[PDB]
Motif scaffolding. Structure first.
Motif, PDB file in Angstrom:
ATOM      1  N   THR A  92       0.063 -77.534 -15.201  1.00 37.09           N
ATOM      2  CA  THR A  92       0.358 -76.302 -15.943  1.00 37.09           C
ATOM      3  C   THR A  92      -0.893 -75.467 -16.235  1.00 37.09           C
ATOM      4  N   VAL A  93      -0.745 -74.153 -16.095  1.00 35.83           N
ATOM      5  CA  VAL A  93      -1.782 -73.178 -16.431  1.00 35.83           C
ATOM      6  C   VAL A  93      -1.141 -72.035 -17.211  1.00 35.83           C
ATOM      7  N   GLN A  94      -1.669 -71.715 -18.380  1.00 36.28           N
ATOM      8  CA  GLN A  94      -1.172 -70.549 -19.090  1.00 36.28           C
ATOM      9  C   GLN A  94      -1.883 -69.301 -18.586  1.00 36.28           C
ATOM     10  N   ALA A  95      -1.122 -68.328 -18.099  1.00 36.06           N
ATOM     11  CA  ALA A  95      -1.713 -67.111 -17.543  1.00 36.06           C
ATOM     12  C   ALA A  95      -0.774 -65.940 -17.677  1.00 36.06           C
ATOM     13  N   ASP A  96      -1.359 -64.776 -17.923  1.00 39.56           N
ATOM     14  CA  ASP A  96      -0.600 -63.551 -17.906  1.00 39.56           C
ATOM     15  C   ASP A  96      -0.680 -62.949 -16.524  1.00 39.56           C
ATOM     16  N   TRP A  97       0.468 -62.569 -15.966  1.00 39.79           N
ATOM     17  CA  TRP A  97       0.548 -61.862 -14.677  1.00 39.79           C
ATOM     18  C   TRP A  97      -0.474 -60.731 -14.458  1.00 39.79           C
TER      19      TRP A  97
END
Ligand SMILES: Nc1ncnc2c1ncn2[C@@H]1O[C@H](CSCC[C@H](N)C(=O)O)[C@@H](O)[C@H]1O
Length: 240
Positions: free
Chosen positions: A91-96
């Motif tokens: 998992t990686v938290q990222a904004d488009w």
């Protein structure tokens, strides 16, 4: 702002409570998987992991998947759902809009499924998101991006059912700038969600405009009671 997030987290909880992934996987084809397989795809980036159905489906198929999402809370649910099905999610938290900030690899394919792209209400953000996806694709990479069929609604207003009659989806308000759907579950639960009603050709325009050389759009009939029109579209956009 903490209530909107909490409201949607309740929604996806309710969705996964009442709709089991095995039924969903039988209903969704193996079309997406076959499409990736016939392109020799190995590395897949999932940019709309949510609670992880697409990601887990691709891990089970044997792809190497990176599972990204803007929401840390979604990703926690995704990781534990993957854990339950016996897989280690990455998992990686990222904004488009700055996908590039936390992701340092390039991919054979990117999936953006479950009518996700529709959550952007600004055209600037749409362009940026697509450009970020494009940079994250290898030269021969491919973007798989889906959406509801909003053209059908904009131009005959009734409920659509999914997984038999487990949930119904009804357009309460639809204009060029906003679609509000009422979701009603079999246990009585109701959720109301806003999303941006992308026209088929408009999404295609956006993809062609940020650099994608070729786009094939497939009609996808997901609803229980089928109509002449598909209720979804899947855009298959090749970087080349
Ligand atoms: N701008 C953005 N950047 C990154 N993720 C975003 C985003 N806007 C919405 N999302 C994420 O996109 C997801 C839509 S839900 C899709 C779940 C999954 N694809 C399925 O089909 O079951 C949410 O989990 C939300 O957190």
């Amino acid at each position: 702002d903490h209530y909107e997030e909490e409201y949607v987290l309740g929604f996806v909880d309710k969705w996964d409570e009442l709709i089991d992934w095995e039924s969903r996987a039988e209903s969704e084809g193996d079309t997406i998987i076959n499409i990736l397989k016939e392109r020799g795809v190995k590395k897949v980036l999932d940019v709309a992991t949510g609670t992880g159905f697409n990601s887990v489906r691709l891990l089970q198929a044997g792809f190497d998947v990176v599972s990204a999402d803007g929401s840390a809370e979604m990703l926690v649910k995704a990781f534990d759902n993957a854990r339950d099905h016996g897989y280690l999610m990455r998992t990686v938290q990222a904004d488009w809009r700055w996908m590039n900030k936390d992701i340092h690899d390039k991919f054979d394919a990117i999936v953006c499924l479950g009518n996700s792209f529709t959550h952007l209400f600004d055209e600037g953000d749409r362009r940026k998101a697509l450009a970020e996806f494009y940079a994250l694709l290898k030269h021969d990479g491919v973007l798989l991006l889906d959406q509801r069929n909003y053209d059908a609604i904009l131009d005959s207003k009734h409920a659509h059912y999914y997984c038999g009659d487990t949930v119904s989806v009804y357009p309460e308000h639809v204009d060029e700038g906003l679609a509000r759907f009422k979701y009603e579950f079999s246990d009585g639960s109701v959720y109301n969600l806003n999303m941006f009603p992308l026209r088929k050709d408009y999404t295609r325009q956006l993809l062609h405009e940020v650099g994608f050389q070729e786009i094939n759009t497939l009609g996808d009939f997901k609803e229980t009671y089928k109509e002449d029109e598909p209720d979804f579209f899947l855009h298959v956009a090749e970087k080349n």
